[PDB]
């Protein structure tokens, strides 16, 4: 149960990197909770924003 971002040393999540973000959403495309993905709280927020800015820009779906 390790954080992706702490692990790989990633300090900035980018809403344009869709193929990363897709690791953290469900197949429906709901965001996955932090207790499932191992993510740090710190990153979960960042991640949460990114995905939201993605979704606005139709890079991810709101609902698959």
């Amino acid at each position: 149960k390790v954080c992706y971002f702490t692990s790989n040393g990633i300090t900035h999540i980018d809403y344009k990197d869709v193929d990363l973000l897709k690791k953290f959403v469900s197949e429906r495309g709901k965001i996955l909770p932090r207790r499932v993905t191992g993510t740090n709280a710190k990153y979960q927020r960042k991640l949460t924003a990114a995905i939201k800015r993605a979704r606005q820009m139709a890079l991810l779906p709101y609902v698959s």
Partner: protein
């Protein structure tokens, strides 16, 4: 590594003898039960895994697509386990009907005739047809009579080995847990029933939480979700949740491990 090598040799022997068109023994794995798989497909749409295909004509790869998505999820062990419980068992036969769970058309067991009678026959048919060259009609009719009765038998002798092996394992797990009554362990809800829910530990030991130990609420089983839902609390114990359990009782003769829920 050894797995894969044995597989290809077992694949290569089968294929050679199918094209030869002589009586031979194959290891077959039929298509899974369409009703059981229909219930498996439903179960995975609850977790959000959406498959492409129908229960009467699934390609094996579609099932692999699920197993790749759930990899390193909490749900893995159980969707894994629930798919399994939609699969048919593999059996031996004289006909080439293919192996579903290796997604091949030609398979036999050749690589262990010390410890499997079907392998030992594959060694005799190889010596009969290829080495000796005895592809006469009387040789073929002899084996074509005998292989249906060997195939049926040896199949049933395998299932009698497995059932027995498992029954010694489950006995010695239970023997393991007799000195662990009282101890608290983290686990994962492997199954949920009308009478309770089963919990798997990190050494694969299984134990029941009977509804009578769920003293905080009146639990109702929801068959569609696979869950125990409280009426009052609104607590929901599902297949695939991580929970901590305590060991209450262990009956070695019966092979029962009873648990109680400390927390979620």
């Amino acid at each position: 590594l050894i797995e894969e090598f044995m597989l290809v040799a077992n694949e290569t022997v089968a294929e050679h003898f199918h094209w030869m068109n002589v009586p031979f023994i194959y290891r077959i794995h039929e298509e899974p039960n369409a009703e059981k798989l229909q219930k498996f497909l439903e179960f995975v749409t609850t977790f959000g895994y959406v498959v492409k295909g129908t229960a009467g004509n699934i390609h094996p790869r579609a099932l692999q697509s699920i197993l790749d998505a759930v990899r390193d999820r909490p749900e893995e062990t159980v969707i894994s386990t629930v798919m399994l419980r939609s699969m048919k068992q593999a059996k031996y036969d004289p006909q080439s009907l293919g192996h579903f769970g290796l997604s091949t058309e030609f398979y036999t067991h050749f690589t262990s005739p010390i410890r499997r009678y079907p392998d030992l026959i594959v060694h005799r048919l190889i010596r009969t047809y290829l080495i000796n060259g005895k592809v006469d009609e009387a040789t073929q009719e002899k084996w074509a009579e005998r292989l249906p009765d060997i195939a049926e038998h040896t199949s049933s002798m395998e299932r009698r080995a497995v059932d027995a092996e498992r029954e010694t394992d489950d006995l010695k797990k239970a023997e393991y847990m007799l000195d662990k009554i009282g101890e608290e362990f983290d686990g994962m809800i492997s199954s949920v029933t009308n009478f309770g829910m089963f919990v798997e530990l990190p050494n694969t030991i299984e134990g029941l939480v009977h509804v009578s130990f769920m003293t905080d609420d009146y639990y109702r089983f929801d068959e569609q979700h696979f869950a125990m839902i409280g009426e009052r609390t609104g607590n929901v114990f599902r297949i695939g949740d991580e929970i901590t359990v305590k060991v209450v009782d262990v009956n070695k003769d019966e092979r029962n491990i009873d648990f109680e829920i400390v927390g979620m």
